[PDB]
Amino acid sequence: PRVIVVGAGMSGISAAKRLSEAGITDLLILEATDHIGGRMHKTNFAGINVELGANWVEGVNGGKMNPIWPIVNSTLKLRNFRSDFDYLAQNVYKEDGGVYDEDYVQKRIELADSVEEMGEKLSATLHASGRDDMSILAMQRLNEHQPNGPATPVDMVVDYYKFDYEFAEPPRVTSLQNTVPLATFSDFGDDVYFVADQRGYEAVVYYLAGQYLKTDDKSGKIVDPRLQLNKVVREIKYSPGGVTVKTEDNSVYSADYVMVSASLGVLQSDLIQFKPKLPTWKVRAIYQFDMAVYTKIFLKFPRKFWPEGKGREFFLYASSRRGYYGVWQEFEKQYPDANVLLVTVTDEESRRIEQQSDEQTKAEIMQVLRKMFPGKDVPDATDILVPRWWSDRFYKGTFSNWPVGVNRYEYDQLRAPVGRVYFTGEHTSEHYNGYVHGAYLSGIDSAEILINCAQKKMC
């Protein structure tokens, strides 16, 4: 059967690969941008390549092997480093200047950890139907006996680093049952390794693609006509006998099936028109799940002024405004000579910042740093890079997040095909939504569902 695959990010390339393996080689992969890899994407900033998107392989060293790991660490040997969060307590900056007392901070962190652990015990007792689910915030109130969760600047920044820095939305919006604990860590292990290689984390996608598409023997570039870039799908017509797909450049294609890998955010926009319209059950499941936004703002400076050394990699800024430029990282190991810093923001701050100029953002950031290092002469950053994933029509966000209120069944309707229209992507991952490994496994699972239906007539 001929199958069209929309998008060449991790899940599409992974699905097309699994299909090829089942012998379905009459594939046509239509990618909107001029390159493959999607949300795994590097860029040159200040003379070095940095990740605009995914940057870590998360869940390593546990009882099960994360499928992405061996590819990164062994096959490609991409250069990487294990992240150590053990010293945060020495690195939390007061709004006004200097760090807080390490011991006071270590205790707040412990407290927050213990609450989360009680949350894990509670979560384990909820019903599968999801009828007792609650937000993480609700769990925090219950466990600490208060009418509110973390509320002082220090408590809030710890709360942010613990939850928003991972999920990109606050605990109060997040489903407890479906995030605490996270399978990723539960199955694959607690460690995370930051990929810092000039070839880019995306190299993992290129490697997979190359196992089945044709590439130039000199170039190594993919040259298989089954892959077509700069193809923006804008309409998908389907019927019980097949599908027709139309691109923005006016091409029209026909196939037996279509496998849609665009992000949940793309699905929640009107970029692709379905004809007929998708059924209400499908539409509702789409709009109920969240497409979150995580913005990695890189900054380059004329010289260093922050600390470097053991436990110095990660540091927090405890603003009285929750989530305001709060999570910092310095790359003494990764980009040794650079003078680069990375501050991460999400959600509301991300949408606000995407909507303003880089210069305006640089100026806000400069005020924060000077507040943090009142004792130093802080030079203005020379360059800044603000990724605009929510504004990008091909992504509309960075990764899904499971909101309180959505149960497994509705989550499942997200993965559900509609006649011959199949779906894949990180938001369709049964237990690893949000992650690279989840996009990867989702491609395989989606492809297998299509295979059984198409090939064995078992749908």
Ligand X SMILES: *[C@@H]1O[C@H](CO)[C@@H](O[C@@H]2O[C@H](CO)[C@@H](O)[C@H](O)[C@H]2NC(C)=O)[C@H](O)[C@H]1NC(C)=O
Chain residues binding ligand FAD by CB under 6 A are 6-12, 30-33, 38-40, 53-56, 58, 231-233, 261-263, 266, 271-272, 294, 296, 389, 394-395, 398-399, 425-426, 434-436, 438-439
**Residue with token string 């270590």:** 106
- The entry of ligand GZZ, ligand FAD, a copy of itself, none near residue 22 (CB within 5 to 8 angstroms by kind) is none
Contacts of ligand GZZ in 304-323 (CB under 6 A) = none
Closest distance of CB 394 from ligand FAD, Å = 4
Shortest CB 205 distance to ligand FAD, Å: 8
Extract the runs of DSSP E, i.e. beta strands, from 69-118: 80-82, 92-94
Judge whether 134 is annotated as a binding position. no
Q: Which of 395, 392, 390 is nearest to 169 (CA)?
A: 390
Q: Which residues are catalytic?
A: 58
On whether 395 is known to bind a ligand per the annotation, the reply is yes
The residue count for binding ligand X (CB under 6 A) is 4
Interacting partner of 149 out of ligand FAD, ligand GZZ, ligand X, none (Cβ under 5 to 8 A depending on kind): none
Query: In the 8-state DSSP scheme, what is residue 222?
Result: B
Tell whether residue 201 is among the known ligand binding residues: no
Nearer to ligand GZZ by Cβ, of 53 and 222: the residue is: 53
Check if the beta carbon of residue 265 is closer than 8 Å to that of residue 291. Answer: yes
Per partner kind, with CB cut-offs from 5 to 8 A, the member of ligand FAD, a copy of itself, ligand X, none near residue 116 is none
Is residue 178 within 8 A of residue 134, CB to CB? The reply is no
- Please answer whether residues 180 and 117 qualify as being in contact, where contact means their C-beta atoms are separated by less than 8 angstroms: no
- Which positions from 154 through 173 interact with a copy of itself, judged by CB under 8 A? 172-173
Nearest distance in Å: CB 334, ligand GZZ: 14
3-class DSSP assignment, residue 28: strand
- Give how many residues touch a copy of itself by CB under 8 A: 40
73 binds, among ligand X, ligand FAD, a copy of itself, none (CB under 5 to 8 A by kind): ligand X
Could you tell which of ligand FAD, ligand X, a copy of itself, none binds residue 264, using a CB distance below 5 to 8 A set by kind? a copy of itself
Which of 186, 228 has the CB closer to ligand X?
Answer: 186
Residue 39 counted as an annotated binding residue:
yes
Who's near 176: CB < 8 A, 6+ residues apart? 119, 122, 123, 126, 133, 134, 135, 136, 138, 139, 404
Does 221 engage in binding with a copy of itself (CB under 8 A)? Answer: no
Q: What is the DSSP string of 271-317?
A: SSEEESPPPHHHHHHHHHSEEE-EEEEEEE-SS--S--STT-SEEEE
Q: How far is 407 from 133, CA to CA, in rounded Å?
A: 8
73 is a site residue for ligand X (CB under 6 A): yes
Structure tokens at 351: 């949408």
Query: With binding defined as CB under 6 A, does residue 192 bind ligand GZZ?
Result: yes
Residues 6+ apart with CB under 8 A from 211: 17
Q: Are 34 and 230 in contact (CB under 8 A)?
A: yes
Question: Distance (Å, rounded) from C-alpha 442 to C-alpha 428?
Answer: 6
Q: Is 166 annotated as a binding residue?
A: yes
DSSP, residue by residue, 370-390: HHH-TTS-PPPPSEEE---TT
10 labelled binding-site residue: yes
Chain breaks in the chain (C to N over 2.5 A) after: none
- Please state the closest distance from residue 188 (CB atom) to ligand GZZ, in A: 10
- CB neighbourhood size of 209 (10 A): 22
Q: Write out the residues near ligand X by the rule CB under 6 A.
A: 60-61, 73-74
Contacts with a copy of itself by CB under 8 A lie at: 131, 133-135, 138, 141-142, 145-148, 151-152, 172-173, 264-265, 268-270, 283-284, 287-288, 291, 320-322, 348, 351-352, 355-356, 390, 396-397, 403-405, 407
Using CB under 6 A, list all residues that contact ligand GZZ. Answer: 56, 165-167, 178-179, 182, 185, 190, 192, 399, 401-402, 433-435
Which residues are documented as binding site for substrate?
58, 166, 434
